[PDB]
Amino acid sequence: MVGQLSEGAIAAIMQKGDTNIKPILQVINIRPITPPRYRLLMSDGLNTLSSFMLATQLNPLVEEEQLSSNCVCQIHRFIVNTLKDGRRVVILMELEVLKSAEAVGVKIGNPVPY
C-alpha cells in the first residue's frame, strides 16, 4: 500500500519547494496549535513531516472527522513558506479526501521523520 501514496513528495517539497504537484498523502494525526488552526503530521509513505498547517476554510473537514488520522487525501493547492532557520512550512489550501480513515484502517508502511 505504500504505492498508493506520493512517495518522495515530502522530500521534493522540502528541497525544490515547487507547488505544481498534487501529492497523495496519508494523515497521521492532527493537532490544534492555537479560531483553531490545525497542524497535521503527514506521510508520503517514505517520510513523515509535521510542518503542515490547514487553511481555516477547511476546518470543517477536521471537525466532522472527514480529514482524520489514517485517511488518505490529495492536495490540490498549497503554499510553501521558508523560515529564517531553514525550515519550510506547508499551508494546505485545497484538498480532496480520497479514502476515509476507516476505509484505510492502518498507518501505511513505516515512514520515518524527514
Binding site: 496549535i33 509535521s50 498547517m53 523560515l83 512550512v89
Partner: peptide
C-alpha cells in the same frame, strides 16, 4: 520540523523576521 510558534509566525512573514 518547527515549533508551533514559528509555524504560527510563518502565517505573518513580518512576525517571522523577528521571532
Amino acid at each position: 520540523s518547527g515549533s508551533d510558534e514559528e509555524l504560527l509566525a510563518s502565517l505573518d512573514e513580518n512576525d517571522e523576521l523577528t521571532a
